[PDB]
Amino acid sequence: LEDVVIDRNLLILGKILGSVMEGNLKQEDGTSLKVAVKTMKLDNSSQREIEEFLSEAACMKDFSHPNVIRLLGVCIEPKPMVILPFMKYGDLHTYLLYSRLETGPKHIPLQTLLKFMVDIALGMEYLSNRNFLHRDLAARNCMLRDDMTVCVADFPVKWIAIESLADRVYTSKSDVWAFGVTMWEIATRGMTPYPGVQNHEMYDYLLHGHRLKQPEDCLDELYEIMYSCWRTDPLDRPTFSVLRLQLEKLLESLPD
């Protein structure tokens, strides 16, 4: 059960980054790794929030994919602390904004944009196969690896699917809805979803059939892919494995 638990003494906490802090983890191999330490705002006076925490934690430590963040361990003071690899390049959201500045990253071609999307599709395929729900999929939660590949992490009304807003239901298809909204952030290079539309308007807005509008120089085929993610009936939406292959093929059809 409690194999993932790491001794507090092996950990050094630094300045607050986003509460998520910077840290130095000392490993079994002698060396030290740079980490990020999310402290959970968790409910005590009831062991129910803490039991579900560890249960997911243990399941998360066994996750080993190049497009999914690695849960390096769990520490406890009685505050629970997830330990994660530190990514010097940061979240994909900020990167995208930065890209539209001189002195910041280069102008991103569509090939790299699709490639970001593909990477999230691969991470979400892996999780959907393990029956693990993300629950908070958005571009700001995708981290960039040192080799500039994207992993999903941190597992906001404008990302929630209609059924999840209306009812209390959330499945893999709700995650698929979020993925399209994420797809759209990448194609817009960091726009906020539903410009002009406010948070309390969302439910009635989506209930009338309106969805995220097509970005200007965005391919017809890519909007077709992201739109399939917002079909009213969850069972009408493609799985992450379907989506992964459509993006991989679409990207392959674009020149090198």
Ligand X SMILES: CCCCNc1ncc2c(-c3ccc(F)cc3)nn(C[C@H]3CC[C@H](N)CC3)c2n1
User: In the complex, which residues of this chain contact Ca ion (CB under 5 A)?
Assistant: 220
The answer to whether residue 136 is catalytic is yes
Q: In angstroms, what is the minimal distance from the CB of 153 to ligand X?
A: 4
State which H helix or E strand residue 82 sits in: strand 80-85
The per-residue DSSP string of 30-52 comes to S-EEEEEEEEP----SSTHHHHH
Q: Provide, rounded to whole angstroms, the least separation between the CB of residue 218 and Ca ion.
A: 9
Q: Shortest distance, CB of residue 233 to Ca ion, whole angstroms?
A: 5
253: annotated binding-site residue? no
17 a known binding residue?
yes
| H helix intervals, the chain | 48-61, 92-99, 110-129, 162-166, 172-188, 202-207, 220-227, 240-252
Residues 141-160 touching ligand X, rule: CB under 6 A, are: 141, 143, 153-154
The two structure tokens encoding residue 115:
């490639």
Other C-beta atoms closer than 10 Å to the C-beta of 245 total 15
Which residues within the stretch 124-143 sit at the binding site for ligand X (CB under 6 A)?
A: 140-141, 143
7, 29, 43, 136: the active-site residue:
136
What does the alpha-carbon distance between residue 232 and residue 88 come to, in Å, rounded to a whole number?
38
Binding mask 77-106 for ligand X (x = CB under 6 A): -------x-xxx-xx---------------
**What are the catalytic residues?**
136
